[PDB]
């Protein structure tokens, strides 16, 4: 289909309790495939999907080395950010980084990313051109200046257009059993009395992969966007995801309500109703 590879990184300082903890995970679409945690007894990059286990020892050494180097790098960067924002050294702070690529079904680059956040706020992002920077404030403009001087964007672009795309493609082939299978949601509607006067209709989608899905209720064919409780898509623990949407319905109106499900494993959008 269309696919993506993303690496996520979080460093959290903890002054007085040792060096910052560095956790990083890699995904292809919504499948976790590698993880590194600096608090593990023996930190290595570890496999988390079967189709990556076949990579040889040299893969694991190289990936592990990169993780360890970025763990140290983040530690220097967290000390720099204390200077840039004129902060005391007594508090815990967060530095997050995300990078990766999106490809279309033909396997071509649709979009690259490389972005950082500090204390949960955007700091600096590689723009979609993969050549210019968006700095969120005057602290990040100092980074931008250093990165412009060092032609950093050029190096990121080469990774994003080259290795990012080529290895994602390799992974998509090696994990073609799972990564290129969409599991359609299993859908039903349940009925939950609140009082004599109304009841909740809850439309469920279960066992679906990937996570992207649309779940919508209408009444007499009109979207009930403001009266729908839509819960955040959540993992089941078995690779698949779950989601429901609920509306409060006055007694006897149930058949005026229809639930609408769009998902990539469904050849056509579903329509369902409560069935007493």
């Amino acid at each position: 289909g269309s696919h993506s590879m993303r690496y996520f990184h979080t460093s959290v300082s903890r002054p007085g309790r040792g060096e910052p903890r560095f956790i990083t995970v890699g995904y292809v679409d919504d499948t976790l495939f590698v993880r590194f945690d600096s608090d593990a007894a023996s930190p290595r990059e570890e496999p988390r999907a079967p189709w990556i286990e076949q990579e040889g020892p040299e893969y694991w050494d190289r990936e592990t080395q990169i993780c360890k180097a970025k763990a140290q790098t983040d530690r220097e960067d967290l000390r720099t950010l204390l200077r840039y924002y004129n902060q005391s050294e007594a508090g815990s702070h967060t530095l997050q980084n995300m990078y990766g690529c999106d490809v279309g079904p033909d396997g071509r680059l649709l979009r690259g990313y490389h972005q950082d956040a500090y204390d949960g706020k955007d700091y600096i992002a590689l723009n979609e051109d993969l050549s210019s920077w968006t700095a969120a404030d005057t602290a990040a403009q100092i980074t931008q200046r250093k990165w412009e001087a060092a032609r950093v964007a050029e190096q990121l672009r080469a990774y994003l257009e080259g290795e990012c795309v080529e290895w994602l493609r390799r992974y998509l082939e090696n994990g073609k059993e799972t990564l290129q299978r969409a599991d359609p949601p299993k859908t039903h509607v349940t009925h939950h009395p609140i009082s004599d006067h109304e009841a909740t209709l809850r439309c469920w989608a279960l066992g679906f992969y990937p996570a992207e899905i649309t779940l919508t209720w209408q009444r007499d064919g009109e979207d009930q966007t403001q009266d729908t409780e839509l819960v955040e898509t959540r993992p089941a623990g078995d690779r698949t995801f779950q989601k429901w949407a609920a509306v409060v319905v006055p007694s006897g109106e149930e058949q005026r309500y229809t639930c609408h499900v769009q998902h990539e494993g469904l050849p056509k959008p579903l329509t369902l109703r409560w069935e007493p």
Binding site: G26, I66, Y123, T143, Y159
Partner: peptide, 9 residues
């Protein structure tokens, strides 16, 4: 496969 490039803030 990860980015092997490091760039300090």
């Amino acid at each position: 496969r990860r980015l092997p490039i490091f760039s300090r803030l």
